[PDB]
Design a protein around this ligand. Structure first.
Ligand SMILES: CN(C)c1ccc(C(=O)NCCCCCCC(=O)NO)cc1
Ligand SMILES: [K+]
Ligand SMILES: [K+]
Ligand SMILES: [Zn+2]
Length: 358
């Protein structure tokens, strides 16, 4: 019935310690619009060792636990991108447990939509941290959904390729991954061309949409809708995990895409009208107020509400200056997506999906 909102004061505090206080900012703006009163608030459980090991190796988890300049930390992806800091293991278990909790609410029929805005760390591998992701909560959520759902669709609308989730399932046809992302030689993580379709028994069950700098709402939605329409018809998913990293939004320091929350919101609406069990994740997002703006707007989308344009007073009201509105304005810079290259990509994907059964 009513969407589940994964939240506790303790969870937000844990998450608050790259994105300082971002979790507080997201939650307080959502509360400032009183959207929490229309959702079922569910305290997240901390992920157990066994739950985390549904994906990650015990060697990696014990190392993460142990360092939470160790000679083995380079081997496990900890360092330049993923600093070893105290309590990072408790932080990871909290995020992983929160997404698992959301997945369990979906399995139990408590809701059709469960939200963990602090999840979405799509780069972590079974045995290695990557791209500021210590634990892959999306994979953990998908593996939990697999207890019930025979076909799971993962949609990744983060600026970056969801490589960790794709690689985790690249050999299976039970989970289809779809990532829209900037793809450009030199741009992290460097994978996810349209020719990347998965491996072995999973061949054609990964979909990658490489997009160039400067794309705005209308063309982004056209791409997303056409891919997801073809995907829905070909795969007939029974559950969806949706990653909504806001580093695509105009004003992010990544300064790559030029999206607003309204355009992401149309993609979200298209997925929601499927009326499937849907697990909503956040992810990256480096302009903190814009990320709160985005995910607050999307929470309203989930609840079918139109939010007031004026940022309501709350703890972080001043971060929304000097104009204090919810809307985000695209930057005045070129869209580098050639329409015929985009259509070539769509044709390639359509052909790939003709091989997908059931
Ligand atoms: C100014 N400064 C200190 C930095 C700027 C950029 C990066 C970076 O992109 N590094 C490569 C790793 C990018 C991982 C992207 C994480 C993400 O948003 N995934 O969705 C690093 C430092
Ligand atoms: K993506
Ligand atoms: K797959
Ligand atoms: Zn990203």
């Amino acid at each position: 019935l009513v969407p589940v909102y994964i939240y506790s004061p303790e969870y937000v505090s844990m998450c608050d310690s790259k994105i300082p206080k971002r979790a507080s900012m997201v939650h307080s703006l959502i509360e400032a619009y009183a959207l929490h009163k229309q959702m079922r608030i569910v305290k997240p459980k901390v992920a157990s060792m066994e739950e985390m090991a549904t994906f990650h190796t015990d060697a990696y988890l014990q190392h993460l636990q142990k360092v939470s300049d160790h000679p083995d930390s380079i081997e496990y992806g900890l360092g330049y991108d993923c600093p070893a800091t105290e309590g990072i293991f408790d932080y990871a278990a909290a995020i992983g447990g929160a997404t698992i909790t959301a997945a369990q609410c979906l399995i139990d029929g408590m809701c059709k939509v469960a939200i963990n805005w602090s999840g979405g760390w799509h780069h972590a591998k079974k045995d290695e941290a990557s791209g500021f992701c210590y634990l892959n909560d999306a994979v953990l959520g998908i593996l939990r959904l697999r207890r019930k759902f025979e076909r799971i669709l993962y949609v990744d609308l983060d600026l970056h390729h969801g490589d960790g989730v794709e690689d985790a399932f690249s050999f299976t046809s039970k989970v289809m991954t779809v990532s829209l992302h900037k793809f450009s030689p030199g741009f992290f993580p460097g994978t996810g061309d349209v020719s990347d379709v998965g491996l072995g028994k999973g061949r054609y069950y990964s979909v990658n949409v490489p997009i160039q700098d400067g794309i705005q709402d209308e063309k982004y939605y056209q791409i997303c809708e056409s891919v997801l329409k073809e995907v829905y018809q070909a795969f007939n998913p029974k559950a969806v995990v949706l990653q909504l990293g806001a580093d695509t939004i105009a004003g992010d320091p990544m300064c790559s895409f030029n999206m607003t929350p309204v355009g992401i919101g149309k993609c979200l609406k298209y997925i929601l009208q499927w009326q499937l069990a849907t697990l909503i994740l956040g992810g990256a997002g480096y302009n903190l107020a814009n990320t709160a703006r985005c995910w607050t707007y999307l929470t309203g989308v989930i609840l079918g509400k139109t939010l007031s344009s004026e940022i309501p007073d709350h703890e972080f009201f001043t971060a929304y200056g000097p104009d204090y509105v919810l809307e985000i304005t695209p930057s005045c810079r070129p869209d580098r997506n050639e329409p015929h290259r985009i259509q070539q990509i769509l044709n390639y994907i359509k052909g790939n999906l003709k091989h997908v059964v059931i």
